[PDB]
Design a protein around this ligand. Structure first.
Ligand SMILES: [Cl-]
Ligand SMILES: [Cl-]
Ligand SMILES: [Mg+2]
Ligand SMILES: [Mg+2]
Ligand SMILES: [Mg+2]
Ligand SMILES: [Mg+2]
Length: 379
């Protein structure tokens, strides 16, 4: 019995133990294909199928019963040259607008560095940082300078606001590259980068000294995280959370080849992926519980989800999958954040639950939201 009263007032992340931190984060949602979107080398919020995000969206998320929103942010084309790596002020203001929508609606919020790290193809380059100390130093300098500016811009915000160091770091091969054969250097470099982020945020002082921060393992993969992640040193206890992503089995959840329409024990074998059923969900989450949660280290599932099926029978399996994964997340100590890429809600690969500009629910989103809420908020 370590729990304590929450003698505060405004919405916030809170708690010292993994399970209490998870309660405060509740059920999450990602503002996807939004501030993460980029085109022609520059972040471009409206270029990947969404109109600009609004307060109306965040009010709708809160009314629907979400607790927290992850706001992926791509900064490409909005950061100056070394040594200052100055962030364009208007873009930073836009990030602050979206954070403010979440704050106003009584939601927790996570902001990050997102597609700057995509595939090691831009400045945030693990492949070359692991072989060239000059590159590693430049990456760290940019990471520290950017996070100093972001932290300073949000220094007045309370603990509703979380900073997540970066997104999905890999050398191009998505976890099956030189990270497997190089003796551990890439894993060590990512751990160093997370330490640089923590140090830079904490050095700004004030509220940033005690803010909850998210730090990922390699390619946000559960196995590579439990095997190789090292928790950074910190000046305060219990304010670093391990970030993982979970889409298993991606062939089903994203429906790439439009052939796997069922999932789990009752699925027809000819209509399902050949792996990744219920035992994979609990088996993977058990690794996170054994390595982190049970050792006092909080963790969260920064992205999860499953695309819509227009067919009634297939959609039943999608709702079952989402309900099963959310209930397992609750049982194993991690808040899940659903991946909502928005768009128009048509086609065979739609993640959208809300129109990102009007806040209106799309198609059967209410039923999807209800099953996810049942996993998190119902015993
Ligand atoms: Cl109690
Ligand atoms: Cl499996
Ligand atoms: Mg073009
Ligand atoms: Mg500035
Ligand atoms: Mg390069
Ligand atoms: Mg040198």
């Amino acid at each position: 019995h370590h729990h304590h009263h929450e003698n505060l007032y405004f919405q916030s992340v809170s708690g010292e133990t993994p399970l209490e931190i998870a309660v405060s984060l509740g059920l999450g949602w990602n503002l996807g294909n939004q501030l993460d979107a980029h085109n022609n080398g520059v972040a471009d919020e409206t270029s990947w199928g969404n109109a600009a995000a609004t307060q109306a969206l965040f009010d709708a998320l809160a009314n629907a019963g979400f607790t927290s929103v992850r706001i992926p942010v791509t900064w490409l084309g909005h950061v100056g040259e070394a040594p200052d790596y100055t962030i364009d002020e208007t873009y930073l203001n836009r990030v602050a607008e979206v954070v403010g929508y979440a704050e106003s609606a009584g939601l927790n919020a996570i902001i990050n560095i997102h597609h700057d790290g995509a595939n090691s193809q831009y400045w945030l380059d693990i492949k070359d940082a692991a072989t060239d100390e000059t590159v590693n130093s430049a990456v760290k300098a940019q990471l520290a300078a950017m996070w100093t500016q972001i932290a300073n811009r949000f220094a007045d915000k309370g603990n509703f606001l979380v900073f997540e160091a970066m997104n999905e770091i890999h050398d191009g091969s998505w976890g099956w590259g030189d990270n497997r054969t190089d003796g551990g250097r890439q894993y060590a470099v990512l751990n160093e980068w997370n330490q640089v982020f923590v140090d830079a945020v904490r050095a700004t002082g004030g509220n940033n000294q005690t803010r909850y921060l998210g730090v990922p393992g390699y390619v946000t993969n559960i196995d590579l995280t439990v095997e190789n992640f090292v928790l950074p040193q910190d000046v305060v206890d219990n304010r670093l959370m391990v970030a993982v992503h979970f889409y298993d089995p991606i062939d089903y959840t994203e429906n790439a080849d439009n052939i796997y329409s069922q999932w789990g024990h009752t699925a027809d074998p000819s209509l399902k992926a050949d792996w990744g059923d219920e035992d994979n969900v609990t088996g993977q989450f058990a690794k996170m519980k054994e390595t982190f949660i049970d050792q006092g280290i909080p963790a969260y599932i920064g992205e999860m989800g499953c695309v819509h099926r227009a067919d009634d029978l297939s959609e039943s399996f999608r709702l079952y999958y989402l309900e099963y994964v959310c209930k397992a997340a609750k049982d194993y100590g991690m808040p899940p954040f659903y991946w909502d890429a928005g768009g128009d809600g048509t086609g065979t690969q739609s993640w959208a639950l809300f129109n990102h500009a009007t806040g209106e629910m799309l198609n059967n989103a209410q039923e999807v939201i209800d099953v996810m809420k049942r996993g998190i908020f119902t015993v």
